[PDB]
Amino acid sequence: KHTGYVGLKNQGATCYMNSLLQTLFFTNQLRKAVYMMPTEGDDSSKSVPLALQRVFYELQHSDKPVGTKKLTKSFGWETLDSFMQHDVQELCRVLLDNVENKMKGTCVEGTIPKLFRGKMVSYIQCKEVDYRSDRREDYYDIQLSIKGKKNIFESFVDYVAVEQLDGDNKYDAGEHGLQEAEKGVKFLTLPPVLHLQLMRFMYDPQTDQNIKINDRFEFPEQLPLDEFLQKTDPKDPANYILHAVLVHSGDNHGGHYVVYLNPKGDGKWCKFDDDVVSRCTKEEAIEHNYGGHHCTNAYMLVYIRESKLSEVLQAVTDHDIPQQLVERLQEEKRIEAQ
Amino acid sequence: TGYVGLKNQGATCYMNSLLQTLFFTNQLRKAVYMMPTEGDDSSKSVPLALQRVFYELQHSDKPVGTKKLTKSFGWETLDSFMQHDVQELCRVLLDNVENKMKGTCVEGTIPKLFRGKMVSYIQCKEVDYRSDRREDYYDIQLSIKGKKNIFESFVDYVAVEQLDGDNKYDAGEHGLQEAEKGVKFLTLPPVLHLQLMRFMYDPQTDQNIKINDRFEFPEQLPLDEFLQKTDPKDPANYILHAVLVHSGDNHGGHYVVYLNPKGDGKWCKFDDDVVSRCTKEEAIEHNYGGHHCTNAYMLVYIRESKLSEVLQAVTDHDIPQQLVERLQEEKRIEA
Ligand SMILES: COC(=O)c1ccc(CN2CCC(O)(Cn3cnc4c(-c5ccc(CN)cc5)n(C)nc4c3=O)CC2)c(Cl)c1
Ligand SMILES: COC(=O)c1ccc(CN2CCC(O)(Cn3cnc4c(-c5ccc(CN)cc5)n(C)nc4c3=O)CC2)c(Cl)c1
């Protein structure tokens, strides 16, 4: 009510889910394209696209906290710990893959790659012979190492750092035999919506299963990324605006998951805590989640390219929801009300 | 502390708390070890799953897992535990074990430990008719809204209710009559499970909401004046054994339990895998509530006179060799 935004019910150990759902919902261009999916023939029992349409609809219209049971049912994560055994980016990929496939053949085909997909090069360059292997790869999200790094910039420096293949890890160069080489990645494109997960756990033998890295890790409100591009572009520099901060406090999957957002990209932040949505300060959304200098910190960041902000966050009206969809969900709600 | 914890493996809410609370019911634990579970399916048996959890809590150096248990009684959905009160889960477990103990040398352990008796009376005002009927109970739900403490809650619980107007009592001959109904406790069990009514329907909305009001409970609880008839050689004096605590507003809040397992006033906090010695004030007064939203929702009391028996020592010998061998082979196969 207060903030203009409604929250999501707490209905299980769904960990990152309500955070990710709010984050996706406020990707306005995505929300609109999801509204356009042709789901009239869909089975309301099995359709992930319809379930996301329903959730987004309620988030746009409802005054009361929105429920998500049909959604988790639709993509089959219903056990006591099914969310504990997946990272947030896997849930994102399930959701986005479903709706992307559903958009095939429609006027919004390719929305998901347009918003979230970038491209990178992986190379192996032989040092002592002349042979290089190049592999262009798409990515929808980036996992950044934080252990030993102070900020996003050092994480990106680490990401594109050259690795040496020598000694017992020499590269199989085919007819050139075993060779000393160097292996690394470079960014070719950065997408309009940039999903960064921070590596906040670590599966090491010395730590048995998984411990949470609670170290301080700084991210800026404004992130410039041109220097990590293979080739910059003067008519659109890679300047990114912080949009979402998904936060975990505690040490285990019983910890507290919340998400901070400035949904208009205007620097005015709210905290989304399941059913409770509250106005908050910039400091509480950003610095306070850097981590102890004490276990409350960010594990995922969403950035939007400056040049794409107005389009990615384009206004959404009630009229943007097609009439059939509105009547189907209204009838669901009337059937429930009886 | 000498005590091991339980793994966080889901939104099990009160389960780990209840589990520790029942494990440190030493007499219950011993009787659980004695159940004849040798022919039981290691996947179907709730009694075996309880034996296995208890054994691990007694021996393991590492946080103890609970998955075979939750499978055994089939609460495996995302919100299985959100839709049940703690006393329902306790009853599921105790019904399972009690039934398994039928026809065994420990038959009756569950009622002996947890089952008390009250009388429910209906007394007619204008005619001469009184109906007395005994009811049994394993737990008591105490109203806290507008109650200062446990004493006032018990006073509310035995308070007389008027059956008048359009809810007159249909006694048997005198016809519809104006009467008054109430309960008195006939007996109080050696182990007293008290759930506090910490949620209520709020008219201002239309959900259940959590009452975070202050509510006091004592370390020593005299309950004689709530009996129908007292016993001058054995007054109903109880000692606080467990404080099951919830902090927050919702089932995503934080569940912990405080215990003094030996009845000696040396208190520990059980937070899943973390078991930490703590002050008496942190177990007791700090969980009264008032304005964190951290407070007791369940209390376990033990009759003073029964203390040393309920908390009788349990040794490795008390676990039959067949059960030990079965669980050992179970963890051998896990390789
Ligand atoms: C046992 O109790 C705990 O210890 C504990 C419980 C919950 C949490 C919070 N949740 C952590 C996971 C989450 O999905 C964020 N997230 C996602 N991916 C990660 C990868 C990573 C890197 C590379 C690749 C290959 N391409 C795949 C994954 N690594 C190394 N760490 C993470 C990570 O934290 C969402 C929040 C934490 Cl922090 C600790
Ligand atoms: C928005 O609110 C929340 O999301 C919220 C979420 C979790 C909790 C904590 N959990 C509360 C339930 C718990 O089972 C304790 N418990 C048990 N039985 C109760 C009855 C009662 C009375 C009579 C009868 C008929 N014989 C049956 C039940 N009533 C009226 N209240 C309770 C109660 O609190 C365990 C801990 C709370 Cl406090 C609030």
PDB file of C-alpha atoms in Angstrom, chain A residues 37 76 119 166 190 206 267:
ATOM      1  CA  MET A  37       2.347 -14.724 -24.136  1.00  0.00           C
ATOM      2  CA  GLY A  76       7.940 -28.692  -9.924  1.00  0.00           C
ATOM      3  CA  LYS A 119      28.492 -12.609 -25.586  1.00  0.00           C
ATOM      4  CA  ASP A 166      52.003 -25.172 -17.991  1.00  0.00           C
ATOM      5  CA  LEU A 190      27.222  -6.660 -22.076  1.00  0.00           C
ATOM      6  CA  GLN A 206      38.264 -28.309   4.574  1.00  0.00           C
ATOM      7  CA  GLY A 267      17.659   6.090  -6.812  1.00  0.00           C
TER       8      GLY A 267
END
